[PDB]
Amino acid sequence: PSHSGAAIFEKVSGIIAINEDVSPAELTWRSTDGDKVHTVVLSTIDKLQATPASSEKMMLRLIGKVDESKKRKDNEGNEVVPKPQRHMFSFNNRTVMDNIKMTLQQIISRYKDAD
Amino acid sequence: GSPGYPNGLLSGDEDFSSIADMDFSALLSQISS
Known part of the structure; x- marks a missing residue:
């Protein structure tokens, strides 16, 4: 477990950090200095898809919660x-x-059981 | 050969993640025709 590494979002390169022990855990991307910041609350996220080591791509997708009963x-x-x-x-x-x-994945599975 | 600068501003920034959504479902499954 590291929670933080290095990620790019909207072609601006930055660093990624996970927010736990907080109000519902959020995946916070910040710029290399941190002047730009984006936040993903996982209690609102349903899925996550990442590029395999066989894939030409270097990317990580985060799937949001939608009501498909509509x-x-x-x-x-x-x-x-x-x-x-x-x-x-x-x-x-x-x-x-x-x-x-x-x-x-370990955060959404907590909001997946809802206790 | 020679290094260059790729340009992709034919729309904006959120227009490439709509076609790169068809890109992500072929990577986890990967099927050859």
């Missing part, structure tokens, strides 16, 4: 279902993303 239909009556929003983060090593996702 299924919408088009003019002809075709099923058009609203999709959840995903948050990507670019990386330089697979050993970090798997360690950030590991913590994250």
Whole structure:
């Protein structure tokens, strides 16, 4: 467990930090100095997808919570279902993303049981 | 060869994560045709 490493968001390179012992745990990206900051509250997150070590890509996705029971239909009556929003983060090593996702995954599973 | 600067401002910044969402589902499964 490290909680913090190095991540890129919106082409601006920065450092990623996980927020626990706080009000519901949040994944806080900050700029390399930290003038820019983005926050992901995991009690509002449902899934997480990261680039494999076989993948050409260095990225980490964070899937948000959407209500899919509001299924919408088009003019002809075709099923058009609203999709959840995903948050990507670019990386330089697979050993970090798997360690950030590991913590994250352990945070959402707490809000997944709801006790 | 020679290093260069890639440019990708044909829309904004949030227009590349919509097509790179079709990119992420082929990586975890990976299927050859």
